[PDB]
Amino acid sequence: ANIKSAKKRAIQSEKARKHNASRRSMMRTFIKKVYAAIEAGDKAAAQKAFNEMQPIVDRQAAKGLIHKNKAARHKANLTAQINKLA
Amino acid sequence: MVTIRLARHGAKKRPFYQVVVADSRNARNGRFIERVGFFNPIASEKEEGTRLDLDRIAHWVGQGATISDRVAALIKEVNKAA
Amino acid sequence: VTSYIGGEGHNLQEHSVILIRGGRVKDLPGVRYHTVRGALDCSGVKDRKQARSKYGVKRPKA
Amino acid sequence: KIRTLQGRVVSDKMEKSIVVAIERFVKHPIYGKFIKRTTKLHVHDENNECGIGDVVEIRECRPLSKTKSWTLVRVVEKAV
Amino acid sequence: QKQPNPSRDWLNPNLGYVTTSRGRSKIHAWFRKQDRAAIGGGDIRLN
Amino acid sequence: ARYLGPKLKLSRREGTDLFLKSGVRAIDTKCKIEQAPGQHGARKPRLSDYGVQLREKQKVRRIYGVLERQFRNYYKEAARLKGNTGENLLALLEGRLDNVVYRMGFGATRAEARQLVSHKAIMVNGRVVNIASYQVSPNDVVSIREKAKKQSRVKAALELAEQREKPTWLEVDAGKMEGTFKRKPERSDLSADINEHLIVELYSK
RNA sequence: AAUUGAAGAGUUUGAUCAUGGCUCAGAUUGAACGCUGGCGGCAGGCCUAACACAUGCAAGUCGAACGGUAACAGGAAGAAGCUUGCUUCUUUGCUGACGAGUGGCGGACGGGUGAGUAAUGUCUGGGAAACUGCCUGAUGGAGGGGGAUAACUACUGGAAACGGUAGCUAAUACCGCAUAACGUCGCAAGACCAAAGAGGGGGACCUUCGGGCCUCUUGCCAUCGGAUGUGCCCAGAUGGGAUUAGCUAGUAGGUGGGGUAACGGCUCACCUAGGCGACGAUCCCUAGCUGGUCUGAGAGGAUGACCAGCCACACUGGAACUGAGACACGGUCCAGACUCCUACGGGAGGCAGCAGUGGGGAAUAUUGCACAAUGGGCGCAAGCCUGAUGCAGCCAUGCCGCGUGUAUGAAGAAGGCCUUCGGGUUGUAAAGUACUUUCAGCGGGGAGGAAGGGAGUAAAGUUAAUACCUUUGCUCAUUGACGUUACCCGCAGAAGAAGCACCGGCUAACUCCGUGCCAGCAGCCGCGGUAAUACGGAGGGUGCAAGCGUUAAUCGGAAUUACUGGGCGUAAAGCGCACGCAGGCGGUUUGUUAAGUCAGAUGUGAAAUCCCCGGGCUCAACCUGGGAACUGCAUCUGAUACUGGC
Ligand SMILES: [Mg+2]
Ligand SMILES: [Mg+2]
Ligand SMILES: [Mg+2]
Ligand SMILES: [Mg+2]
Ligand SMILES: [Mg+2]
Ligand SMILES: [Mg+2]
Ligand SMILES: [Mg+2]
Ligand SMILES: [Mg+2]
Ligand SMILES: [Mg+2]
Ligand SMILES: [Mg+2]
Ligand SMILES: [Mg+2]
Ligand SMILES: [Mg+2]
Ligand SMILES: [Mg+2]
Ligand SMILES: [Mg+2]
Ligand SMILES: [Mg+2]
Ligand SMILES: [Mg+2]
Ligand SMILES: [Mg+2]
Ligand SMILES: [Mg+2]
Ligand SMILES: [Mg+2]
Ligand SMILES: [Mg+2]
Ligand SMILES: [Mg+2]
Ligand SMILES: [Mg+2]
Ligand SMILES: [Mg+2]
């Protein structure tokens, strides 16, 4: 990085990246809980998982990490799956 | 953003601008959405020199178009002439 | 490729650079090129006053 | 009224997909002769309605598959 | 550079790259190296 | 840009009087106008069709003092314009400011006129014109500025003009040293020896 | 008013006509070389090595986002030699401001190059499943808590590059919680989702005298929009090769999952066995594509420098991250080859930005000045940055203009060359005489490109308020890189400003030597074997002219690939002859359809260019107004003779 700005951006990017990864990773984990529940065949549990995670997903979307559409999609798929289950 | 600006299409030492409606990011003389008129600072005292389709400009402004400072000045001048 | 040395006389010899321009000498079966006289190494022709441009001959002061 | 093309089926066997040869009658640019030109479009069809050798009216749409961006609206003259 | 690469343009004096004779000679030598009387030899053999 | 050399040689080559010398003293006495220029002038050449056309072209160019490229350009312009092409070309040639001046009678010869134009002697509509080729449009007045009115050369030119034939498309004043370009010169106004058609043909090969 | 345009020639022969090639005359260029060579204007300028790169600069900005002050200029409290009046040395962000930082926005534009790509390309036309910062229009929110973290400090690890611990602090950084629809999810009830404070001025209830409170200005956030931009799809068009005919398992399609901003074999699981293809798939070679450019009467052909649009790429090969947007020329990570530094442990680097250097090359410019404009970035601005851009330099590379004197001038001088020996030619050419001064030289004056911005004010718009802010007027001084600018004047005096090719035929222009089929010429035919208009010179001429030639390259001519526009008994050319799938074509009458066809309309075909009419540079080139044009495509509405379908 020859230009100060680039250097700043680079370090910022690194910092930003670390931040986002943590959030995104967490979100993924949350999703997996729901998915795991679905796989198991535990409906109440699945619902609980969804409840736990949906808000987080929404928050993430709001922040910008994940896109609004993407956030919606997870819910839809998850919603569909849970519905199917019971 | 979308902007109304002078595009310097002329000879050396003899500028002639088109008051074009271009995306700010595009080049000055390069791409544009619509050509709205022209302006000639050289011109001289004869008949014409500055001429802008004001209605189109207004429309663009309404939509959400940034008029350049020079362009704004030109517009003002035109208005006063009118 | 084989090339034709135009004009009378030359300073050409083996392992010497020259500028070639094309345009064949038709009575030589093989030659399709001409050496430009006055360019790079090959000197212009000695003592000519007409068509000098074609043989690299500088303009004599008179 | 949305756009639509008419042509005949070249093949059916792939489940919910029919291949349709649109025969356009373009003029040759240089020479001037009118030639028949083929456009083999892969077309989406629910319930496998068209068979092979049937004329079928088809409309453009969002790409259903890699190749398929057409969907049949009607069938016309199918028995052979 | 790490590799040796003299141009044949350096030998040509009209461009104005080498005024010295010695330098020119040296330059030439390189090309001959890269490349890698008969009558006399024959005579010698005969002798 | 101009022909710096023997004026009458060109005329001789052509055959006819090109008006390259004033006309105070006649062309037939000055040079051997009948004979072509050079050692082989008496040897009458059997001239080809292309050759004749070329000669014609030269004559016209010589008359106005228009070098080849310029002439070609003029021809092209004429072609682009509507009507008879040769006629148009002729008009354009005439329209040359220097030529116009000469016609009026401020240049004895066309060369003189050109020189005057160059030397900021001439004005068109109260504006100086350095350029000899300037196309003098209809209703454009042309004059000499007060600094160049006092020249004897101009007077001489005027006198010469008076002696000679008058153009119809021009108006001129001797005392004021100015005039008016009324309209574009027709084919009937100009000399009939100029076969413009030949010239046109030559710029179609 | 807007394509008003079309030439041949030489050469096969003893001669002819014909076929037929080669070939010249034209236009042209990003051209080069040769010989020259005054100037200007407008243009253009590494086509090859997408080869390597030293140096500088090419992207920074915002202190009105935030703690802070690394330099500086002012006050504030203290004191030194005390010129009786402050110079000076110490302290404190209190202020104008600002190093380094965090944050924001910008580094996705601008600029470059054309390596790759014959299609995740381009052009044209259609679309549907999308996102879209700033700008924008609308409708509602912006409450109340946190804990961090650089910066800064001590002790330290490293040659450096860069760290590492332990502490400290803020924010429009970050995160919960509340609040929560016009949002997201869903059949609903419901569940769930956000933020942002900052700057200028101020009456009084007030005040931990910071500020609360009011106000304006800006910023935040959600949602729907708008515009703009980007992604995606399909049709057709967009090179050559079949001496490349078979190709392809995520392959073609499906159900479901996953993924994407979005649809999609985009990817995975399982199933069906397809899909493409001689209307050329596949493989190979070459190639950015388009507007256009050149050429051409056109139709075409060639072509794609410059300018403009679209694509692709950034030392090679990857990969993601950040973000509205990139899988990012001057960001990150890795590997590679290659240069540099290193204390040998490890680092740094990426001109196809602008200059520049080397190299390659036939060949393509200066490490120039400037932000004065136009545009871009940031900011509330002032402003700062801007190798975009504007200008400047160099090169006749092009185009255009201008000049290089004008008029006169027989002794037809001299000299030159020829020479029937008279002259006749150079040639009115020169000299002489008169006259003029373009540009160049000197000295002077002297616009336009400059519109904005800054202070004071007065009014109106906001509000508790005549403050502040915004809007509109006005005077005041201002803002030029180019710049001894364009442009005008005066001075002296033709002074300083012509050369290149050609001259047998084609092909405009001819005489005179040496030699001797030698030397040389040459585009083709052909010249040269002792009297050469063809070779070299001289004169004389002809062509062009600051250029001229040569060479290369394209179209033209070449109707010589013929669509327009050719042929095939004998010149090249009828399969040896049949049958025959695909294809092409298809007698005749009525109906119908409207695909072709025709007509009209609508949208589009970017702008520039081309073309026409104009306008502006002294004219021109150049610029430029408006038009026409873009012969195309799509949709809609009709026509139904002809062609097609039924
Ligand atoms: Mg799904
Ligand atoms: Mg070289
Ligand atoms: Mg010229
Ligand atoms: Mg030179
Ligand atoms: Mg700062
Ligand atoms: Mg925030
Ligand atoms: Mg699926
Ligand atoms: Mg390539
Ligand atoms: Mg033709
Ligand atoms: Mg890459
Ligand atoms: Mg992202
Ligand atoms: Mg770079
Ligand atoms: Mg004599
Ligand atoms: Mg001057
Ligand atoms: Mg002749
Ligand atoms: Mg010759
Ligand atoms: Mg042809
Ligand atoms: Mg034939
Ligand atoms: Mg035969
Ligand atoms: Mg037969
Ligand atoms: Mg004019
Ligand atoms: Mg257009
Ligand atoms: Mg019928």
DSSP symbols for D19-56: EEEEEE-PBPTTT--B--EEEEEEEE-TT----TT-EE
User: Are residues F119 and F134 located together in one domain of the fold?
Assistant: yes
Q: What is the DSSP letter of C35?
A: E
Residue by residue, DSSP assigns E18-44 as: ---HHHHHHHHHHHHHHH--HHHHHHH
Do residues B1 and B64 make contact, with C-beta atoms less than 8 angstroms apart? yes
CA dihedral for F5, F7, F9, F15, sign (positive or negative): positive
Long-range contacts from C51-59, C-beta under 8 angstroms, 24+ separation: C54/C6, C54/C7, C55/C6, C55/C7
Q: What is the CATH number of the domain that holds F52?
A: 1.10.1050.10
> Can you tell me whether residue F9 is helix, strand or coil?
helix
Residue D19 burial (CB count, 10 A): 18
In angstroms, rounded to a whole number, what is the distance separating the alpha carbons of residues F172 and F155?
13
Nearest to C25 by CA among C4, C2, C7: C4
Long-range contacts from B6-11, C-beta under 8 angstroms, 24+ separation: B6/B39, B6/B68, B6/B70, B6/B71, B6/B74, B7/B32
In angstroms, rounded to a whole number, what is the distance separating the alpha carbons of residues B9 and B37?
12
Is residue F185 in a domain?
no
Alpha helices in chain F (DSSP H): 7-14, 27-30, 49-64, 68-80, 85-95, 97-104, 110-118, 146-149, 152-163, 196-202
Nearest chain C Cα to E9, which residue?
A: C17
Distance A36 CA to ligand 7 centre (A): 22
Number of domains into which chain F is organized:
2
Number of domains into which chain A is organized:
1
Is residue F24 in a domain?
yes
Do residues F101 and F113 make contact, with C-beta atoms less than 8 angstroms apart? yes
Do residues D75 and D48 make contact, with C-beta atoms less than 8 angstroms apart? no
The token pair that represents F121 in the structure block: 């002697």
The token pair that represents F92 in the structure block: 């354009």
Cα(first)–Cα(last) distance of chain A, in Å? 55
In angstroms, rounded to a whole number, what is the distance separating the alpha carbons of residues D51 and F201?
70
Q: Beta strand C3-5 with C33-35: parallel, antiparallel or unpaired?
A: parallel
**Which of chain G's bases lie under 7 Å from a protein CB?**
4-7, 25-27, 33-38, 41-43, 58-61, 100-107, 109-111, 126-137, 174-177, 183-187, 191-195, 221-223, 225-229, 232-238, 252-255, 257-266, 272-279, 299-301, 307-310, 321-324, 328, 330-332, 338-340, 349-350, 358-362, 373-377, 388-392, 399-410, 412, 417-418, 424-429, 434-439, 448-453, 472-473, 488-490, 498-503, 506-511, 519-526, 536-553, 563, 583-585, 595-597, 606-608, 611-613, 615-626, 634-637
Nearest chain E Cα to C16, which residue?
A: E12
> Domain limits at A74?
1-86
Sole residue written with tokens 């002769």: D33
- Residue type at position A11: I
- CA A14 remoteness from chain centre: 20
- Interface partners of A (3+ CB pairs, < 8 Å)? none
- Which ligand ends up closest to the CA of D65? 7
Distance F86 CA to ligand 15 centre (A): 26
Q: Measured between CB atoms, does E32 come within 8 Å of chain C?
A: no
User: Are residues F34 and F88 located together in one domain of the fold?
Assistant: yes
Question: Per DSSP, what are the bridge partners of residue D76?
Answer: D55
> Can you tell me whether residue C20 is helix, strand or coil?
strand
Give Cβ neighbours of residue F147 (< 8 Å, ≥ 6 apart): none
Sole residue written with tokens 């002061």: C61
Distance F124 CA to ligand 2 centre (A): 55
| Ion ligand 2: residue ranges with CB closer than 5 A | E 9
The kind and range of the H/E element at B55 are helix B54-63
Q: Beta strand B37-39 with B50-52: parallel, antiparallel or unpaired?
A: antiparallel
User: Are residues F36 and F84 located together in one domain of the fold?
Assistant: yes
In angstroms, rounded to a whole number, what is the distance separating the alpha carbons of residues F42 and F33?
12
> Domain limits at F159?
94-180
User: Taking the domains of chain B in order of start, what are their residue ranges?
Assistant: 1-81
**Resolution limit, Å:** 3.0
User: Are residues F175 and F195 located together in one domain of the fold?
Assistant: no
Experimental method: cryo-EM
> Can you tell me whether residue D6 is helix, strand or coil?
strand
Residue D54 burial (CB count, 10 A): 19
Nearest to D49 by CA among D57, D38, D41: D57
Do residues F107 and F116 make contact, with C-beta atoms less than 8 angstroms apart? yes
Nearest to F116 by CA among F79, F63, F158: F158
Do residues D24 and D7 make contact, with C-beta atoms less than 8 angstroms apart? no
> Domain limits at D40?
3-79
User: Are residues F12 and F78 located together in one domain of the fold?
Assistant: yes
Q: What is the CATH number of the domain that holds F145?
A: 3.10.290.10
Q: Measured between CB atoms, does E12 come within 8 Å of chain C?
A: yes
| Chain C residues with beta carbon closer than 8 angstroms to that of E12 | 17, 40-41
Do residues C49 and C18 make contact, with C-beta atoms less than 8 angstroms apart? no
